[PDB]
Design a protein around this nucleic acid. Structure first.
Ligand SMILES: [Mg+2]
Ligand SMILES: [Mg+2]
Ligand SMILES: [Mg+2]
Ligand SMILES: [Mg+2]
Ligand SMILES: [Mg+2]
Ligand SMILES: [Mg+2]
Ligand SMILES: [Mg+2]
Ligand SMILES: [Mg+2]
Ligand SMILES: [Mg+2]
Ligand SMILES: [Mg+2]
Ligand SMILES: [Mg+2]
Ligand SMILES: [Mg+2]
Ligand SMILES: [Mg+2]
Ligand SMILES: [Mg+2]
Ligand SMILES: [Mg+2]
Ligand SMILES: [Mg+2]
Ligand SMILES: [Mg+2]
Ligand SMILES: [Mg+2]
Ligand SMILES: [Mg+2]
Ligand SMILES: [Mg+2]
Ligand SMILES: [Mg+2]
Lengths: 70, 117, 156, 67
RNA sequence: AAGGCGGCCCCCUGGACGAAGACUGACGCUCAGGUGCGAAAGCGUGGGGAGCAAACAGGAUUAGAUACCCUGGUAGUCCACGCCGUAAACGAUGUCGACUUGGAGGUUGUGCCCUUGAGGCGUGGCUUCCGGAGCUAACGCGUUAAGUCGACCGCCUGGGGAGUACGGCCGCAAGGUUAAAACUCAAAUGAAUUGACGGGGGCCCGCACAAGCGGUGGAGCAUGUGGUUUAAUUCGAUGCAA
RNA sequence: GCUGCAUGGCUGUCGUCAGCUCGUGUUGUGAAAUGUUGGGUUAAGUCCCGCAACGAGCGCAACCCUUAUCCUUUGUUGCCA
């Protein structure tokens, strides 16, 4: 998040590095998470839904690879 | 009045209003501006244009101090935490540093209950 | 527009000089389905400039066109709920189209003895670049400079 | 594609005193990288987490990017 | 074991699994009563109290709003020691044992192979996903069975009444546990199918928007409707579709 | 004279939107499903490929009218090289 201006660095690329570092640290995401209190049931349920969807998309990738269309 | 030529701007952009405050190195506030002060009401303050208009008015309120080099400390998740940057840049300041100063708790204290709108 | 993409429409070129631009200019100047009078005034305007500037009036209208043709535009959009005037580069088929349109209403607000005379003065004053057309083009340039702050908004 | 680094050389615990192979698993913001991206084995990532926590306790390594 | 357990360190301590042996010699499984543990909320006494937040107050919203939204806010949440013994305490799936085709992972051991190596072959424990036979009303389960079987325990007998009354036991209370009957209906119910609907979603099309031109809404008049008036102001057509 | 909320006939509407079905076969204990889904494409359930589906029908399209070109036939009341 802390960025220093190097030599031959215009404001354009300076702000781009700022923004890119913002996602990499993820700071905006974690602020939105703590914006509201979430129940242990709720994080467990959301993570379980996330896990099943990642896994479902995972094997759907191989099934689409192994199937033949037209 | 007192000419020092170097300061730091602070951009606290909440989800509803953004506030810009240029201060000296050790934190004595030189000037400030805000979206509500710029003359907007309701969601108009939240819009990044409000943040855009607030940055010129906060630079042209410190312009009597002769400041040209300044850092920027960006805090808050609200929209307009990118608009004020180039707004200040356009006003004519040689941006020295950019630093994200948003407070991320290491999961201490309890947030308010979810809004059931 | 939504399903099948199509190209531009071909317009019969200018008969007296062989240009496509003069025909399109006079067509957009045409109002209320009157091209007969439109042809008369466009010929009169070009010949006044022919006697004023060099004999080849082709280049005089060309230079009066280029100094007012816009290469950057202002487009209103809403992505996240805020009004964005995104500036975009415009392709030349629209560049010259928007330039001559503005000239059309620029002449109307001139308010000279006749419509033919005011077009002639407008096209001449654009050649020296002191014209209200250049005024409008400097006006769009300042707001375009202003929109460079919007230039990095959503849907760049 | 990616293979764990500490599997190549026999390591009995991750040493907290080390700063080599600790600074690289910390990111620019001071956070510590997941096994997902750094391609390391779950056997050592628990030890790596413990090692980083010990090091930042003793101020060899920083908690955050600022301090 | 379940409830549950998340900074790092130290002290005390339980279980699990793997390798190669040694040893005891059926010492085993299950379990009515009984005992112990048992989220959150709650109760007692004494602390503590930043954040959050029942109650309560005010402001909005609304026909009303004892709510949803906002600003505040006490109990409680935190600690010590007792009590409570209830949860969608769920895998809605008792414990123990044996047998029955496979495949990909995760996690933790362990024997080997030119150990060359940032390489493979075996063997265990635990754990997710898919699926075969089979089973199932179907959905589905499928070696971690809801398959094939044995041991024992718990429980069920139409929907309401009702997990209520009374009695007993436990509790400071809140209440918990055991647990009916009269009366009433011809259903209640599970899974799945076709539609219809959703203030559900994804994609595609249309002058639907966008890009343009010209308008209406401003003026006058014509015309229809509403309203009003009158003896009647004939009757029908009222979202787009008057 | 009343009831279109008893009706026939007729009409508006989504909307000329592209859908609505059947036979045989197969699947399911069965209601039913499949066909009709999917990759594209089209103005279109239009077409193609795949596909336990193979075909078929009503709709789409085509046939009807007009306009855009030419040839032949008759020339007045129409035409004049
Ligand atoms: Mg408690
Ligand atoms: Mg208490
Ligand atoms: Mg509240
Ligand atoms: Mg539980
Ligand atoms: Mg119970
Ligand atoms: Mg149960
Ligand atoms: Mg037992
Ligand atoms: Mg299965
Ligand atoms: Mg009771
Ligand atoms: Mg009017
Ligand atoms: Mg009717
Ligand atoms: Mg059939
Ligand atoms: Mg059959
Ligand atoms: Mg259909
Ligand atoms: Mg069907
Ligand atoms: Mg179907
Ligand atoms: Mg298709
Ligand atoms: Mg059609
Ligand atoms: Mg068809
Ligand atoms: Mg087909
Ligand atoms: Mg047709």
């Amino acid at each position: 998040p802390v960025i220093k201006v190097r030599e031959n660095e215009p404001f354009d690329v300076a702000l781009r590095r700022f923004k890119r570092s913002c996602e990499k640290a993820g700071v905006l995401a974690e602020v939105r998470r703590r914006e509201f209190y979430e129940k242990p049931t709720t994080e467990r349920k959301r993570a379980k839904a996330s896990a099943v969807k990642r896994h479902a998309k995972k094997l759907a990738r191989e099934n689409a690879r192994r199937t033949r269309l037209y | 009045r007192k000419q020092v030529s170097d300061g730091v701007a602070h951009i606290h952009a909440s989800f509803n209003n953004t506030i810009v405050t240029i201060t000296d190195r050790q934190g004595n506030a030189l000037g400030w501006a805000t979206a509500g002060g710029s003359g907007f009401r309701g969601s108009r303050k939240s819009t990044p244009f409000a943040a855009q208009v607030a940055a010129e008015r906060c630079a042209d309120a410190v312009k009597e101090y002769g400041i040209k080099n300044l850092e920027v400390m960006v805090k808050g998740p609200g929209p307009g935490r990118e608009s004020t940057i180039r707004a200040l840049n356009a006003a004519g300041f040689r941006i020295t540093n950019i630093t994200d100063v948003t407070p991320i708790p290491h999961n201490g204290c309890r947030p308010p209950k979810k809004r059931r709108v | 527009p939504r399903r099948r993409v199509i190209g531009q429409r071909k317009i019969l070129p200018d008969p007296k000089f062989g240009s496509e631009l003069l025909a399109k200019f006079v067509n957009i100047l045409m109002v209320d389905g009157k091209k007969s009078t439109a042809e008369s005034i466009v010929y009169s305007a070009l010949e006044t400039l022919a006697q004023r500037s060099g004999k080849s009036e082709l280049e005089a209208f060309e230079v009066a066109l280029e100094n007012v043709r816009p290469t950057v535009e202002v487009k209103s959009r809403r992505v996240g709920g805020s009004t964005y005037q995104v500036p975009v580069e415009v392709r030349p088929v629209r560049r010259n189209a928007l330039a001559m349109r503005w000239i059309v209403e620029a002449a109307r607000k001139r308010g000279d003895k006749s419509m033919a005379l005011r077009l002639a003065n407008e096209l001449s004053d654009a050649a020296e670049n002191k014209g209200t057309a250049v005024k409008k083009r400097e006006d769009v340039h300042r707001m375009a400079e202003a929109n460079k702050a919007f230039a990095h908004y959503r849907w760049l | 594609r990616k293979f764990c680094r500490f599997t190549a050389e026999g390591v009995q615990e991750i040493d907290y005193k080390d700063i080599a192979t600790l600074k690289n698993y910390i990111t620019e913001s001071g956070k510590i990288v997941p096994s997902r991206i750094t391609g390391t084995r779950a056997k050592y990532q628990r030890q790596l987490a413990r090692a980083i926590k010990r090091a930042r306790y003793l101020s060899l390594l920083p908690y955050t990017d600022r301090h």
